[PDB]
Coordinates of C-alpha atoms in Angstrom, one line a residue:
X1 CA 29.5 7.5 39.5
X2 CA 27.0 5.0 38.2
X3 CA 26.5 2.0 40.4
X4 CA 29.3 -0.6 40.3
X5 CA 26.5 -3.1 39.8
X6 CA 23.1 -3.0 38.2
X7 CA 20.4 -5.5 37.4
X8 CA 19.3 -5.2 33.7
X9 CA 16.4 -6.8 31.9
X10 CA 16.3 -9.0 28.8
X11 CA 13.1 -10.3 27.2
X12 CA 12.7 -14.1 26.8
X13 CA 11.0 -14.6 23.4
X14 CA 8.2 -17.1 23.4
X15 CA 7.8 -20.0 21.0
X16 CA 5.1 -19.2 18.5
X17 CA 2.4 -21.8 18.3
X18 CA 2.3 -24.4 15.5
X19 CA -0.2 -24.0 12.8
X20 CA -1.4 -27.2 11.1
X21 CA -4.0 -28.1 8.5
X22 CA -7.1 -30.0 9.6
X23 CA -5.3 -33.3 9.3
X24 CA -2.3 -32.1 11.4
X25 CA 0.0 -31.3 8.5
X26 CA 2.4 -28.5 9.5
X27 CA 1.8 -25.1 7.9
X28 CA 3.7 -22.7 10.1
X29 CA 6.5 -23.9 12.3
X30 CA 8.8 -21.9 14.7
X31 CA 12.4 -22.5 13.8
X32 CA 15.2 -22.0 16.4
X33 CA 17.5 -19.0 15.6
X34 CA 20.2 -17.1 17.4
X35 CA 20.3 -13.3 17.9
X36 CA 23.6 -11.7 18.9
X37 CA 23.8 -8.5 20.9
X38 CA 26.9 -6.7 22.1
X39 CA 28.2 -4.2 24.6
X40 CA 30.1 -1.6 22.5
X41 CA 32.1 -0.6 25.6
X42 CA 33.6 -4.2 25.6
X43 CA 33.9 -4.4 21.8
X44 CA 36.0 -1.2 21.9
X45 CA 38.6 -3.1 23.8
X46 CA 39.0 -5.9 21.2
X47 CA 39.1 -4.0 17.9
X48 CA 41.5 -6.4 16.2
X49 CA 38.7 -9.0 16.4
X50 CA 36.2 -6.8 14.5
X51 CA 36.8 -7.9 10.9
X52 CA 36.5 -11.6 11.8
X53 CA 33.3 -10.9 13.7
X54 CA 31.9 -8.7 10.8
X55 CA 32.6 -11.6 8.4
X56 CA 30.9 -14.1 10.6
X57 CA 27.9 -11.7 10.8
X58 CA 27.9 -11.3 7.0
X59 CA 28.5 -7.6 7.4
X60 CA 31.0 -5.2 5.7
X61 CA 34.2 -4.6 7.7
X62 CA 34.1 -0.8 7.6
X63 CA 30.3 -0.5 8.0
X64 CA 30.6 -2.8 11.0
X65 CA 33.4 -0.7 12.6
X66 CA 31.6 2.5 11.9
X67 CA 28.5 1.1 13.7
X68 CA 30.5 0.1 16.8
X69 CA 32.4 3.3 16.9
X70 CA 29.2 5.5 16.6
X71 CA 27.7 3.5 19.5
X72 CA 30.8 3.4 21.6
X73 CA 29.0 5.0 24.6
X74 CA 26.1 2.5 24.5
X75 CA 26.1 -0.7 26.5
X76 CA 23.6 -2.6 24.2
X77 CA 23.2 -2.9 20.5
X78 CA 22.0 -5.8 18.3
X79 CA 24.6 -7.2 16.1
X80 CA 22.4 -9.5 14.0
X81 CA 19.0 -11.2 14.4
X82 CA 17.9 -14.6 13.3
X83 CA 21.1 -16.5 12.5
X84 CA 20.8 -20.2 12.2
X85 CA 21.9 -21.9 15.4
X86 CA 25.0 -23.2 13.5
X87 CA 25.9 -19.7 12.3
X88 CA 25.3 -18.4 15.8
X89 CA 27.6 -21.0 17.4
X90 CA 30.3 -20.0 14.9
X91 CA 30.0 -16.4 15.8
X92 CA 29.9 -17.2 19.5
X93 CA 33.0 -19.4 19.1
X94 CA 35.1 -16.4 18.1
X95 CA 35.1 -15.5 21.8
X96 CA 35.0 -11.7 21.1
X97 CA 34.7 -9.6 24.3
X98 CA 31.2 -8.1 24.6
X99 CA 29.3 -10.5 22.4
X100 CA 26.2 -12.1 23.9
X101 CA 23.3 -14.2 22.5
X102 CA 19.6 -14.6 22.8
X103 CA 17.6 -17.7 21.6
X104 CA 14.7 -16.6 19.4
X105 CA 12.5 -18.3 16.7
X106 CA 11.6 -17.6 13.1
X107 CA 8.8 -19.1 11.1
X108 CA 9.0 -21.6 8.3
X109 CA 6.1 -22.4 6.0
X110 CA 6.4 -26.0 4.7
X111 CA 3.6 -25.7 2.1
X112 CA 4.9 -22.4 0.8
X113 CA 3.0 -20.6 -1.9
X114 CA 0.2 -23.3 -1.9
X115 CA -1.4 -21.7 1.2
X116 CA 0.4 -18.4 1.2
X117 CA -2.6 -16.0 1.8
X118 CA -4.6 -18.2 4.2
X119 CA -1.7 -18.9 6.6
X120 CA 0.0 -15.5 6.0
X121 CA 3.4 -14.8 7.6
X122 CA 5.3 -13.0 10.4
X123 CA 7.3 -9.8 10.5
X124 CA 10.9 -9.5 11.6
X125 CA 9.8 -9.4 15.2
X126 CA 8.1 -12.7 14.7
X127 CA 4.7 -11.0 14.7
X128 CA 1.8 -11.9 12.4
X129 CA 1.5 -9.6 9.4
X130 CA -0.9 -11.4 7.1
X131 CA -3.6 -14.1 7.0
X132 CA -4.1 -16.5 10.0
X133 CA -0.7 -15.4 11.5
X134 CA -2.3 -11.9 11.8
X135 CA -5.8 -12.9 12.7
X136 CA -4.7 -15.2 15.5
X137 CA -1.6 -13.3 16.4
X138 CA -2.3 -13.0 20.1
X139 CA -3.2 -16.7 20.4
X140 CA -0.1 -17.8 18.4
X141 CA 2.4 -15.4 20.0
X142 CA 2.0 -16.1 23.7
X143 CA 3.8 -13.8 26.0
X144 CA 7.5 -13.0 26.3
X145 CA 9.2 -13.7 29.6
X146 CA 11.7 -11.5 31.4
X147 CA 15.0 -12.4 33.0
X148 CA 17.6 -10.3 34.9
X149 CA 21.3 -10.2 34.4
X150 CA 23.8 -8.6 36.7
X151 CA 26.0 -6.0 34.9
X152 CA 28.9 -3.9 36.0
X153 CA 29.3 -0.2 35.8
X154 CA 30.3 -0.4 32.1
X155 CA 27.6 -2.9 31.2
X156 CA 29.7 -6.0 31.2
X157 CA 27.5 -9.1 32.1
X158 CA 28.7 -10.7 35.3
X159 CA 26.1 -13.4 35.6
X160 CA 22.4 -14.3 35.3
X161 CA 20.3 -13.1 38.3
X162 CA 17.0 -14.9 37.7
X163 CA 14.0 -15.1 35.5
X164 CA 11.3 -12.8 36.9
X165 CA 8.5 -13.9 34.5
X166 CA 8.6 -17.1 32.5
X167 CA 7.6 -17.0 28.8
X168 CA 4.1 -18.3 28.1
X169 CA 4.4 -20.3 24.9
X170 CA 2.2 -19.5 21.9
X171 CA -0.7 -21.9 21.4
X172 CA -1.3 -24.4 18.6
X173 CA -3.9 -23.9 15.9
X174 CA -5.5 -26.4 13.5
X175 CA -7.0 -24.7 10.5
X176 CA -10.1 -25.9 8.7
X177 CA -8.1 -25.9 5.5
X178 CA -7.5 -29.4 4.1
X179 CA -4.1 -29.2 2.4
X180 CA -5.1 -32.0 -0.1
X181 CA -8.0 -29.8 -1.3
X182 CA -5.9 -26.6 -1.1
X183 CA -3.3 -28.1 -3.4
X184 CA -5.9 -29.2 -5.9
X185 CA -7.6 -25.7 -5.8
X186 CA -4.2 -23.9 -6.0
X187 CA -3.1 -26.0 -9.1
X188 CA -6.3 -25.7 -11.0
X189 CA -6.8 -21.9 -10.3
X190 CA -3.2 -21.3 -11.4
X191 CA -3.7 -23.4 -14.6
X192 CA -7.0 -21.6 -15.4
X193 CA -5.3 -18.1 -15.1
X194 CA -2.5 -19.2 -17.4
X195 CA -4.8 -20.6 -20.0
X196 CA -7.2 -17.7 -19.8
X197 CA -4.4 -15.0 -19.6
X198 CA -6.1 -13.7 -16.5
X199 CA -4.9 -10.9 -14.1
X200 CA -5.9 -12.7 -10.9
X201 CA -8.4 -15.0 -9.3
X202 CA -9.8 -16.7 -6.2
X203 CA -11.2 -20.0 -5.3
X204 CA -13.0 -20.9 -2.0
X205 CA -14.3 -24.3 -0.9
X206 CA -16.5 -24.7 2.1
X207 CA -18.1 -27.5 4.0
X208 CA -21.7 -26.6 3.9
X209 CA -22.6 -28.6 7.1
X210 CA -19.8 -27.3 9.3
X211 CA -19.1 -23.8 8.0
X212 CA -15.4 -24.7 7.6
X213 CA -13.3 -23.2 4.9
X214 CA -11.6 -26.2 3.3
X215 CA -9.6 -24.3 0.8
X216 CA -8.9 -20.6 0.0
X217 CA -6.5 -19.8 -2.8
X218 CA -5.7 -16.7 -4.8
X219 CA -3.6 -15.9 -7.8
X220 CA -1.1 -14.4 -8.0
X221 CA 0.5 -16.0 -4.9
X222 CA 4.0 -15.9 -3.4
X223 CA 6.4 -17.9 -1.4
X224 CA 6.2 -16.7 2.2
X225 CA 9.7 -18.2 2.9
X226 CA 11.3 -15.9 0.5
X227 CA 9.7 -12.6 0.1
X228 CA 12.7 -10.8 -1.5
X229 CA 11.0 -9.2 -4.6
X230 CA 7.4 -10.0 -3.6
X231 CA 5.2 -7.6 -5.4
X232 CA 2.1 -6.1 -3.5
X233 CA -0.3 -7.6 -6.2
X234 CA 0.8 -11.1 -5.1
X235 CA 0.3 -10.5 -1.4
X236 CA -3.3 -9.5 -1.7
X237 CA -5.8 -12.0 -0.1
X238 CA -8.3 -11.4 -2.9
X239 CA -10.9 -13.9 -1.6
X240 CA -11.4 -11.8 1.5
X241 CA -10.4 -8.3 0.2
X242 CA -11.7 -7.9 -3.3
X243 CA -15.3 -6.8 -3.5
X244 CA -17.4 -7.1 -6.6
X245 CA -21.0 -6.9 -7.7
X246 CA -22.1 -10.6 -7.9
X247 CA -24.5 -10.3 -10.8
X248 CA -26.6 -13.3 -11.8
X249 CA -25.0 -15.4 -9.0
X250 CA -27.4 -13.9 -6.6
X251 CA -30.6 -14.8 -8.6
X252 CA -30.9 -18.0 -6.5
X253 CA -31.5 -15.8 -3.4
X254 CA -34.0 -13.7 -5.2
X255 CA -35.7 -17.0 -6.2
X256 CA -35.6 -18.2 -2.6
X257 CA -37.5 -15.1 -1.6
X258 CA -40.0 -15.6 -4.5
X259 CA -40.7 -19.2 -3.4
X260 CA -41.0 -18.1 0.3
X261 CA -43.6 -15.4 -0.6
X262 CA -46.4 -17.8 -1.4
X263 CA -46.8 -16.2 -4.8
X264 CA -44.4 -18.3 -7.0
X265 CA -43.8 -21.9 -7.8
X266 CA -41.1 -23.4 -10.1
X267 CA -43.5 -24.2 -13.0
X268 CA -44.6 -20.6 -13.2
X269 CA -44.0 -18.8 -16.4
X270 CA -42.7 -15.3 -16.9
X271 CA -42.7 -13.6 -20.3
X272 CA -39.3 -11.9 -20.7
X273 CA -39.7 -10.8 -24.4
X274 CA -38.0 -8.9 -25.9
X275 CA -35.2 -9.3 -23.4
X276 CA -35.7 -5.7 -22.0
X277 CA -38.1 -4.1 -19.5
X278 CA -38.7 -0.4 -19.3
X279 CA -39.2 1.1 -15.9
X280 CA -39.6 4.8 -16.3
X281 CA -36.4 6.1 -17.8
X282 CA -34.4 3.0 -16.9
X283 CA -34.2 -0.1 -19.1
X284 CA -33.4 -3.5 -17.6
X285 CA -31.6 -5.6 -20.3
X286 CA -30.8 -9.3 -20.6
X287 CA -27.4 -10.2 -22.0
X288 CA -29.1 -12.9 -24.2
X289 CA -32.4 -11.8 -25.7
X290 CA -33.8 -14.9 -27.5
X291 CA -36.6 -15.7 -25.1
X292 CA -40.3 -15.1 -24.5
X293 CA -41.8 -17.5 -21.9
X294 CA -39.4 -19.0 -19.4
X295 CA -40.2 -21.0 -16.3
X296 CA -38.4 -20.1 -13.1
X297 CA -35.6 -22.5 -13.8
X298 CA -35.4 -21.0 -17.3
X299 CA -34.9 -17.5 -15.8
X300 CA -31.8 -18.9 -14.0
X301 CA -30.5 -20.8 -17.1
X302 CA -30.9 -17.7 -19.3
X303 CA -29.7 -15.3 -16.6
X304 CA -32.8 -13.3 -17.3
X305 CA -32.5 -9.9 -15.5
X306 CA -36.0 -9.1 -16.9
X307 CA -37.5 -12.3 -15.5
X308 CA -36.1 -11.9 -12.0
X309 CA -37.0 -8.2 -12.0
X310 CA -40.7 -9.0 -12.8
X311 CA -40.7 -11.5 -9.9
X312 CA -39.0 -8.9 -7.7
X313 CA -41.6 -6.3 -8.4
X314 CA -44.3 -8.8 -7.5
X315 CA -42.8 -9.9 -4.2
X316 CA -41.1 -6.6 -3.1
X317 CA -37.5 -5.8 -2.6
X318 CA -37.7 -6.2 1.2
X319 CA -38.1 -10.0 0.9
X320 CA -35.0 -10.2 -1.3
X321 CA -33.0 -7.9 0.9
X322 CA -33.9 -10.0 3.9
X323 CA -32.7 -13.3 2.4
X324 CA -29.5 -11.7 1.1
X325 CA -28.7 -10.1 4.5
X326 CA -29.5 -13.3 6.3
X327 CA -27.2 -15.4 4.1
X328 CA -24.4 -12.9 4.7
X329 CA -24.0 -11.0 1.5
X330 CA -22.4 -7.7 2.4
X331 CA -22.2 -8.7 6.0
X332 CA -19.4 -9.3 8.5
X333 CA -18.2 -13.0 8.2
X334 CA -17.1 -12.9 11.8
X335 CA -13.7 -14.4 10.8
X336 CA -11.8 -11.5 12.4
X337 CA -9.1 -11.0 9.7
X338 CA -8.0 -7.4 10.1
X339 CA -8.6 -5.6 6.8
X340 CA -11.2 -8.1 5.5
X341 CA -13.7 -6.2 3.4
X342 CA -17.5 -6.4 4.2
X343 CA -18.8 -4.8 0.9
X344 CA -22.3 -3.4 1.0
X345 CA -25.9 -4.5 0.8
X346 CA -28.0 -1.4 0.0
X347 CA -31.1 -0.7 2.0
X348 CA -34.1 1.6 1.6
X349 CA -37.3 2.4 3.3
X350 CA -39.0 3.0 -0.1
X351 CA -37.3 0.9 -2.8
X352 CA -37.2 2.6 -6.2
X353 CA -38.0 0.1 -9.0
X354 CA -34.5 0.4 -10.5
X355 CA -32.9 -0.4 -7.1
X356 CA -35.3 -3.4 -6.6
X357 CA -34.5 -4.8 -10.0
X358 CA -30.7 -4.4 -9.8
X359 CA -30.6 -5.9 -6.3
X360 CA -32.5 -8.9 -7.6
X361 CA -30.0 -9.6 -10.5
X362 CA -26.9 -8.7 -8.5
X363 CA -25.9 -5.1 -9.2
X364 CA -25.7 -2.4 -6.6
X365 CA -24.6 -4.7 -3.9
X366 CA -21.0 -5.7 -3.5
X367 CA -19.6 -8.8 -1.9
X368 CA -16.5 -10.9 -1.5
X369 CA -15.9 -14.4 -2.7
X370 CA -16.0 -15.7 0.9
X371 CA -19.4 -14.1 1.4
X372 CA -20.7 -15.6 -1.8
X373 CA -19.4 -19.0 -0.9
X374 CA -21.0 -18.8 2.6
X375 CA -24.3 -17.8 1.0
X376 CA -24.2 -20.8 -1.3
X377 CA -23.3 -22.9 1.7
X378 CA -26.5 -21.9 3.4
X379 CA -28.5 -22.8 0.3
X380 CA -26.7 -26.1 0.0
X381 CA -27.2 -26.9 3.7
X382 CA -30.9 -27.1 3.3
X383 CA -31.3 -23.4 4.1
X384 CA -29.2 -23.4 7.3
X385 CA -26.4 -21.0 7.6
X386 CA -23.6 -22.2 9.9
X387 CA -21.1 -19.5 11.0
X388 CA -17.9 -19.5 9.0
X389 CA -14.7 -21.0 10.5
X390 CA -11.1 -21.0 9.4
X391 CA -10.3 -23.4 12.2
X392 CA -11.2 -27.1 12.6
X393 CA -14.7 -27.6 13.8
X394 CA -15.3 -30.7 16.0
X395 CA -18.7 -29.7 17.4
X396 CA -20.9 -28.3 14.7
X397 CA -22.6 -25.1 15.8
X398 CA -26.3 -24.4 15.2
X399 CA -27.0 -22.5 12.1
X400 CA -29.7 -20.0 11.5
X401 CA -32.5 -21.4 9.4
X402 CA -32.4 -18.6 6.9
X403 CA -34.4 -20.3 4.1
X404 CA -37.0 -23.1 4.8
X405 CA -35.7 -26.6 4.0
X406 CA -38.4 -27.0 1.4
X407 CA -37.5 -23.8 -0.4
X408 CA -33.8 -24.6 -0.2
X409 CA -34.4 -28.1 -1.7
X410 CA -36.4 -26.6 -4.5
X411 CA -33.7 -24.1 -5.4
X412 CA -31.1 -26.8 -5.2
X413 CA -33.0 -28.8 -7.8
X414 CA -33.3 -25.6 -10.0
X415 CA -29.5 -25.1 -9.8
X416 CA -28.9 -28.7 -10.7
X417 CA -30.9 -28.0 -13.9
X418 CA -28.8 -24.9 -14.5
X419 CA -25.8 -27.2 -14.7
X420 CA -27.4 -30.3 -16.3
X421 CA -30.1 -29.0 -18.6
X422 CA -29.8 -28.1 -22.3
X423 CA -28.7 -24.5 -22.6
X424 CA -27.1 -24.6 -19.1
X425 CA -23.5 -24.3 -17.9
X426 CA -22.2 -27.4 -19.7
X427 CA -18.6 -27.2 -18.6
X428 CA -19.6 -27.0 -14.9
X429 CA -20.8 -30.6 -15.0
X430 CA -18.9 -32.8 -12.5
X431 CA -18.4 -36.4 -14.1
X432 CA -19.9 -39.1 -11.8
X433 CA -21.8 -36.5 -9.8
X434 CA -24.8 -34.2 -10.1
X435 CA -23.7 -30.7 -9.4
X436 CA -25.6 -27.5 -9.0
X437 CA -24.6 -23.9 -9.5
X438 CA -24.9 -20.5 -11.2
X439 CA -22.7 -18.4 -13.4
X440 CA -22.3 -14.6 -13.4
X441 CA -20.2 -11.7 -14.6
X442 CA -19.0 -9.5 -11.8
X443 CA -12.3 -5.8 -17.6
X444 CA -14.8 -8.2 -15.9
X445 CA -14.7 -11.1 -13.5
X446 CA -16.1 -14.5 -14.5
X447 CA -17.9 -16.0 -11.5
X448 CA -19.2 -19.5 -10.8
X449 CA -20.8 -20.5 -7.5
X450 CA -22.2 -23.9 -6.8
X451 CA -22.3 -27.1 -4.7
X452 CA -22.3 -30.9 -4.9
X453 CA -23.6 -33.5 -4.8
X454 CA -26.7 -31.6 -6.0
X455 CA -29.3 -33.9 -4.3
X456 CA -27.4 -34.2 -1.0
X457 CA -24.9 -31.3 -0.8
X458 CA -21.6 -31.5 1.0
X459 CA -19.2 -28.9 -0.6
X460 CA -19.8 -25.3 -1.8
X461 CA -17.4 -23.5 -4.0
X462 CA -16.8 -20.1 -5.6
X463 CA -14.5 -19.5 -8.5
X464 CA -13.6 -15.9 -9.5
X465 CA -11.4 -15.3 -12.6
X466 CA -10.4 -11.6 -12.8
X467 CA -10.0 -10.1 -16.3
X468 CA -9.5 -13.2 -18.5
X469 CA -7.7 -12.0 -21.7
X470 CA -6.9 -15.2 -23.7
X471 CA -9.0 -18.1 -25.0
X472 CA -8.9 -21.2 -22.8
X473 CA -9.2 -24.8 -23.9
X474 CA -13.0 -24.9 -23.7
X475 CA -15.6 -22.3 -24.8
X476 CA -18.2 -20.9 -22.4
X477 CA -17.9 -19.3 -19.0
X478 CA -14.3 -19.1 -17.9
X479 CA -14.9 -20.1 -14.3
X480 CA -17.1 -23.1 -15.0
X481 CA -14.4 -25.7 -15.9
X482 CA -12.4 -24.8 -12.9
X483 CA -15.4 -25.6 -10.7
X484 CA -15.8 -28.9 -12.5
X485 CA -12.2 -30.0 -12.1
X486 CA -11.8 -28.9 -8.5
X487 CA -15.2 -30.2 -7.4
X488 CA -14.4 -33.6 -9.1
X489 CA -11.2 -34.0 -7.1
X490 CA -12.5 -32.5 -3.8
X491 CA -15.5 -34.8 -3.6
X492 CA -13.3 -37.8 -4.1
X493 CA -10.6 -36.7 -1.7
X494 CA -13.5 -36.4 0.9
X495 CA -14.8 -39.9 -0.1
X496 CA -18.2 -38.4 -1.0
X497 CA -20.4 -41.0 -2.7
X498 CA -22.0 -40.2 -6.1
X499 CA -25.6 -39.4 -6.0
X500 CA -26.3 -40.3 -9.6
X501 CA -27.6 -43.8 -8.9
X502 CA -29.5 -45.7 -11.6
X503 CA -32.9 -44.8 -10.0
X504 CA -32.4 -46.1 -6.4

């Protein structure tokens, strides 16, 4: 016979660590629940109790009975996982022979859909599946304990023996996300999609000095507390997973290389007439073709592919590739989110003219919205690229000085003109502040990337609107007004003073 007594092991689930926003607002909270297990050998002695037990478990009478009967020779099965503690005590109070309980936890997400992708969610086993819950799973999960119970020959629990290993609680995590800014970004991106009839979109806000991600929202979104019917489209963390060719939004990096070469200054003029440039078989074409001479700021205002290409041929692709690589376009962010996409930054030993030109005006490389925002953050932070963080930064790390402060300041002023000057991106203007930025077109994505205050930058932001299909309230670039609204609120939520003084 089997021994009259045996010492069996039961895991002790650990309490998963609290996730908060940067201000301590709870974002993911472990909630006590009760799991019930049973010894079928004992249940088989108390069959008249089964229907009441099945009812208390929310299970069908006959499906429940079938399950016990088919497991009659086992000494352990789960009856139900994750009942409320109240529902649990109700089941336990039936006093059915062979019914036992385990204290576990399940997550609740107080901000729900507002921060769905960034926070992510746990699986049925309380394990991180998406977002920060996934990226920091080991930190948040801790380590289960193990305890021993004395059982008899038929698996009846006689008593607790001891705990052999205590559970190590999961550890707390404060995100860089500011829920105040995340709500503003979530609301405005949702409104922009509705008014533009768009498929999807993303918005990222970064602190340019600290590398912190202050907001990251995508549409569609979902309620992580109720995923019954959640469609895969909604679950996608587009800001980190969708790659696209950034188009004219990378011209400022080409310009930074031009100004660093020693060969170009902002007042220089390039003749871009007639809005095309033939290089062998290939023709470089501007979208708008109403220009002849443009200064360097003009090339940006007009999104002149021709103009930036002539500059690129003069300075060489290598110098542009170097800046783009160093600011992180097509490069690992270091954020450690499994499944994050890196995109691609093409390299060559001998750069063909077509590849040089297209790199310079943003085709042939592919990036994510996070990378684009980090790149603009370096430009905004006087050329210093601080590593990205999704967690609160108290001690600011050194950044790599990727662009000289002087070149960065010059480009900031050019991008301020892109927003402010006649012919520029009118609806990107941020009332009460000077803002700086650049539009582009990634079945298209509308892109806007920028920062503010333009003369002393604090915040960088990228807006991506995927496949707009309906006319919005304002004309012009679809993503521009979203930048305007979100930047206006974010700057004020952060108490950033206006930089548009009357000449002081």
